[PDB]
Ligand binder design. Structure first.
Ligand SMILES: [Mg+2]
Ligand SMILES: [Mg+2]
Ligand SMILES: [Mg+2]
Ligand SMILES: [Mg+2]
Ligand SMILES: [Mg+2]
Ligand SMILES: [Mg+2]
Ligand SMILES: [Mg+2]
Ligand SMILES: [Mg+2]
Ligand SMILES: [Mg+2]
Ligand SMILES: [Mg+2]
Ligand SMILES: [Mg+2]
Ligand SMILES: [Mg+2]
Ligand SMILES: [Mg+2]
Ligand SMILES: [Mg+2]
Ligand SMILES: [Mg+2]
Ligand SMILES: [Mg+2]
Ligand SMILES: [Mg+2]
Ligand SMILES: [Mg+2]
Ligand SMILES: [Mg+2]
Ligand SMILES: [Mg+2]
Ligand SMILES: [Mg+2]
Ligand SMILES: [Mg+2]
Ligand SMILES: [Mg+2]
Ligand SMILES: [Mg+2]
Ligand SMILES: [Mg+2]
Ligand SMILES: [Mg+2]
Ligand SMILES: [Mg+2]
Ligand SMILES: [Mg+2]
Ligand SMILES: [Mg+2]
Ligand SMILES: [Mg+2]
Ligand SMILES: [Mg+2]
Ligand SMILES: [Mg+2]
Ligand SMILES: [Mg+2]
Ligand SMILES: [Mg+2]
Ligand SMILES: [Mg+2]
Ligand SMILES: [Mg+2]
Lengths: 146, 156, 114, 100, 54, 124
RNA sequence: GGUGAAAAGUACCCCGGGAGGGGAGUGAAAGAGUACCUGAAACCGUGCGCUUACAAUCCGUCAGAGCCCUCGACGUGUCGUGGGGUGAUGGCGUGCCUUUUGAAGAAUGAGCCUGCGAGUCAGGGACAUGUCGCGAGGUUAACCCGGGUGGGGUAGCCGC
RNA sequence: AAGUCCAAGAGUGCGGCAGUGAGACGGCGGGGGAUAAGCUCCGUGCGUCGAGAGGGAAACAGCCCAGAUCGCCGGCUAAG
RNA sequence: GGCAGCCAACGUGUUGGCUGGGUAGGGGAGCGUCCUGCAUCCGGUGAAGCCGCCGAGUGAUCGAGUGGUGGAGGGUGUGG
């Protein structure tokens, strides 16, 4: 029978990704992979064996084109005419982490497990984070050649 | 549904009640209603050709004859007084099988009465001989008069 | 296991759900505490339920020789009895059905160490 | 050490002493059967060339013949009146691996 | 307006569970030397003998 | 010969209701409702026995890919290289190696990479 | 419509205004108590095990963590050619019938269970096709005689 | 003239038993309509649906791929 | 690896080739129920019915396999 994780089997690790000068979409896809646990041979779709991901310098994220002014984050309050929009430029100035957060969350599965996976994402605007006690491993976004 | 008592009137109006439409309280779907395609008295007799009936009887009697199950006797009992005890003993000497067909002429009341009460014994006259009773019996016992009467009416 | 006595009141002219509403106040309590609660409960079905509990306590004393103080109401339930059918005439020839429900009430009391 | 054994169009990782259910083989219980290998792992070293794998065979003993789970099929399509009930139990052979 | 559908066993029970009695809080009173339990609301009446302690 | 139906009729009801144990509400309790669900249940089961083979292969492939990329090779080039080397291990067992014996899997990756063409993106 | 072989139909004691019940008796059995043979299902309770209050569920299916129970070998729990109960979580997934070009359909019918409810029967009827007897012939109708299902009956009929 | 030819389960004739005689969309050739309709009426050894599950097209009878005898925790591909 | 239909090849039933989506509808072969001719068997040392357990067959379904409840009939084979 195919290997299935048991109670004690999942081991977490802590990664830190520097978002400075990284393309938003590229950072988010990489982080979603780590949070989901796709890089582990023990991956199981009904189990969150993902790792913790810390994103630092989330205000230095790079976006190409005119998306800074023309890309709009939309929210609806549920009241008639309750549709509000912000550009990514405005959202980066007021809530720097929200830009990276939304990008990563939208690349996670939209189910109960996905919500549990989101717990393991921590994102910070500045160069620093409070999690030195967890000794995060610097993670660089590489591409395996073929 | 036509023979059941009552049921002549349409129970309620065709439309407006909100109930299924009904034509009679005795319709088949009703409890107490008429039966559909139920039994009716019928005659089951069949017009089997004469030659088939005769050949079947001959076949049955031949099967007994080949297995030596045909016996012949002058009388079941001696005298003019029925006695089941005598007949039972005598039949016991002839056959030990349970079912026995005894073929006796009409006149031999004392023989018929003497065997009548025995459990597996069936009594018949030779003019009434038939496949069912022969095949039901383990052994056929003929009065000599009855056997000759049967042979004569057929082989002549 | 504990020594126990049973009482039943059958064909009590009270709906089983209305009895249950009272019974839920006394399940698991000592017989003394149950009879106090039932004495002051405003519900009508309190009175039939009280009588069954007291009857079971009395059986435990007089038939089984248990002491009354140690008695607790271990198990109690009401089951539905036969329902009588009545008709209430309504407006414009409508005739509606009325159900006169009854219930059976079972109590088991245990002698437990205090 | 362990090997990956081919039998019945399927492959099973087995070591000495392993019990494996495989597709029916024609042998009595107590008979020994010899099976081809797709891979051998002897601790650190991996045998993978077809030439050396042809040299090696796994020996197993037939324990018993058995039946898999009863499968109940009830094909159906709505608004048609089409129903087709069918049952199935696959015949299996149980092997105990003896050596590699 | 009439119910559109029958109500599931679960939904019926969830609502029906809200129909329940609450036990009265009881206090002890000494009357005729014996200690009886009465609602605190009736404490004064019970000492005055205005409550029928059956 | 009037025949009462209960004896024959009840048999199929008991079968269906036994099969529908564990269902919720009317589907566990009423023969007609349980029968309806049984139609779906056995249709689903038949369909999922077929789909199960793809679903497991999907799992194995994902696990092989993670282990391959941890050894600096993509899945597609690993499969190509194993074919070129003539290694006939299927994906069920390749995934079991990736989990239970990373050393053996690493040795297979080396074999596959050696058998790959020098210029994978060259004609032929 | 059915207590039991027999009324032997529950003396007497206990709780209760009664009703009803608990002891004690009768009986082979009260898992037979005049609500009575057997006592299904819907429907309504109580107890125990697992589960469930961040979740969008045609209600199931295939994967499946954790817990509970049980059968083997070994030892203090742990593994197996196991078996049950429950099921976090993941994938897949548009009731049944009728009737329609096409219905998950916001078309029709069904609140639920149990019982009942629809190609049957008559006739030397008609056509075809199996099967059996007899065969250039086959067969009787009415009727007559047998306590029968058997024997007789040539008028007819159908082939030629 | 060959092919297929342990069969297309082919044609033709007779007989027993039918059902059907409301079709839909898509490709190609046309009428009616404004060279409108998810329109309407014909042709097409044209297709699919009807009576067809599976994969693709987000979902999506009629499009693309492919015709489900059952089992497998094997492998290779189609459209994509 | 199991089952089935058609056909072939031989044998005193096995091997092989091909085939096995399906509504209206045609054909074939069966399951379960009751009443009966005949033959057999079980039953107050507990029949039927009902509730379970553990199992069984390609399906309708089965259990002369077994617990519980129950109290008088029932099973099987071959025909009608
Ligand atoms: Mg009259
Ligand atoms: Mg009339
Ligand atoms: Mg009329
Ligand atoms: Mg009648
Ligand atoms: Mg005649
Ligand atoms: Mg009036
Ligand atoms: Mg249709
Ligand atoms: Mg596949
Ligand atoms: Mg009894
Ligand atoms: Mg009653
Ligand atoms: Mg009774
Ligand atoms: Mg929660
Ligand atoms: Mg959603
Ligand atoms: Mg979905
Ligand atoms: Mg229409
Ligand atoms: Mg149609
Ligand atoms: Mg509807
Ligand atoms: Mg609706
Ligand atoms: Mg209409
Ligand atoms: Mg309705
Ligand atoms: Mg017409
Ligand atoms: Mg027409
Ligand atoms: Mg047309
Ligand atoms: Mg049109
Ligand atoms: Mg088609
Ligand atoms: Mg399709
Ligand atoms: Mg491939
Ligand atoms: Mg392609
Ligand atoms: Mg064959
Ligand atoms: Mg078919
Ligand atoms: Mg096919
Ligand atoms: Mg049909
Ligand atoms: Mg039977
Ligand atoms: Mg007895
Ligand atoms: Mg009977
Ligand atoms: Mg028959």
């Amino acid at each position: 029978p195919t290997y299935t994780p048991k109670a004690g089997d999942t081991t977490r690790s802590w990664y830190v990704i520097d978002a400075s000068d990284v393309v938003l979409g590229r950072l988010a896809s990489a982080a979603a992979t780590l949070l989901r646990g796709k890089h582990k041979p023990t991956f199981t779709p009904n189990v969150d064996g993902g790792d913790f991901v810390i994103v630092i310098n989330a205000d230095k994220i790079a976006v190409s084109g005119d998306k800074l002014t023309k890309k709009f984050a939309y929210r609806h309050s549920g009241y008639p005419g309750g549709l509000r929009k912000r550009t990514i430029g405005e959202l980066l100035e007021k809530h720097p982490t929200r830009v990276v957060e939304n990008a990563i969350i939208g690349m996670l599965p939209h189910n109960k497990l996905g919500r549990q996976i989101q717990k393991k994402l921590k994102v910070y605007a500045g160069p620093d984070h409070p999690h030195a006690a967890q000794q995060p491993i610097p993670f660089e976004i590489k591409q395996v050649a073929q | 549904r036509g023979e059941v008592s009552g049921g002549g009137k349409k129970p309620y109006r065709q439309k407006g009640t909100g109930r299924a439409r009904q034509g009679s309280t005795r319709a088949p779907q009703f409890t107490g209603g008429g039966t559909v395609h139920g039994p009716k008295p019928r005659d089951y007799s069949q017009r089997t050709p004469k030659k088939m009936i005769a050949a079947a009887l001959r076949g049955a009697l031949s099967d007994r004859a080949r297995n030596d199950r045909i016996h012949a006797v002058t009388e079941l009992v001696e005298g003019q007084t029925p006695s089941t005890k005598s007949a039972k003993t005598f039949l016991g000497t002839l056959t030990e099988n349970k079912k026995v067909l005894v073929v006796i002429g009409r006149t031999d009341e004392v023989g018929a009465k003497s065997v009548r009460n025995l459990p597996g014994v069936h009594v018949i006259s030779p003019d009434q001989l038939n496949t069912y009773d022969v095949l039901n019996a383990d052994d056929v016992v003929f009065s000599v008069e009855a056997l000759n009467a049967y042979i004569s009416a057929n082989s002549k | 296991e504990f020594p126990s006595a049973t009482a039943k009141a059958r064909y009590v002219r009270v709906s089983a759900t209305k009895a249950r509403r009272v019974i839920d106040l006394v399940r698991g309590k000592s017989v003394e505490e149950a009879l106090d609660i039932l004495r002051w409960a405003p519900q009508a079905a309190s009175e039939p339920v009280a009588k069954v509990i007291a009857s079971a306590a009395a059986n435990a004393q007089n038939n089984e020789g248990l002491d009354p103080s140690t008695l607790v109401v271990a198990t109690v339930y009401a089951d539905e009895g036969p329902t009588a059918k009545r008709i209430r005439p309504r407006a414009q020839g409508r005739a509606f059905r009325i159900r006169k429900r009854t219930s059976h009430i079972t109590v088991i009391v245990e002698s437990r160490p205090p | 050490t362990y090997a990956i054994v081919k039998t019945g169009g399927k492959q099973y990782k087995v070591a000495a002493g392993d019990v494996v259910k495989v597709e029916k083989l024609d042998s009595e219980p107590g008979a020994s059967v010899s099976l081809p290998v797709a891979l051998v792992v002897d601790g650190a070293n991996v045998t993978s060339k077809a030439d050396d794998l042809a040299k090696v065979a796994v020996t197993a003993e037939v324990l018993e013949h058995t039946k898999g789970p009863k499968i109940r099929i009830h094909k159906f399509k709505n608004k048609t009146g089409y129903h087709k009930r069918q049952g199935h139990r696959q015949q299996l052979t149980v092997l105990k691996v003896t050596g590699i | 307006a009439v119910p559109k559908r029958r109500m599931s066993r679960a939904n019926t029970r969830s609502r029906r569970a809200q129909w329940k009695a609450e036990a009265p809080g009881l206090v002890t009173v000494s009357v005729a030397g014996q200690q009886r339990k009465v609602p605190r609301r009736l404490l004064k009446a019970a000492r005055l003998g205005l409550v029928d302690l059956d | 010969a009037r025949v009462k139906r209960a004896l024959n009729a009840q048999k199929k009801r008991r079968t269906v209701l036994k099969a529908s144990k564990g269902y919720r509400g009317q589907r566990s309790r009423l023969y007609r409702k349980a029968k309806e669900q049984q139609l779906h249940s056995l249709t689903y089961a038949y369909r999922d026995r077929r789909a199960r083979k793809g679903e497991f292969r999907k799992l194995w492939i994902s696990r092989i890919n993670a282990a391959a990329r941890a050894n600096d090779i993509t899945y597609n080039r690993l499969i190509q290289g194993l074919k070129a080397a003539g290694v006939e291990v299927d994906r069920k067992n390749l995934a079991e190696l990736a989990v239970s014996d990373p050393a053996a899997f690493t040795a297979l990756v080396d074999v596959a990479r050696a058998a790959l063409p020098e210029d994978v993106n060259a004609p032929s």
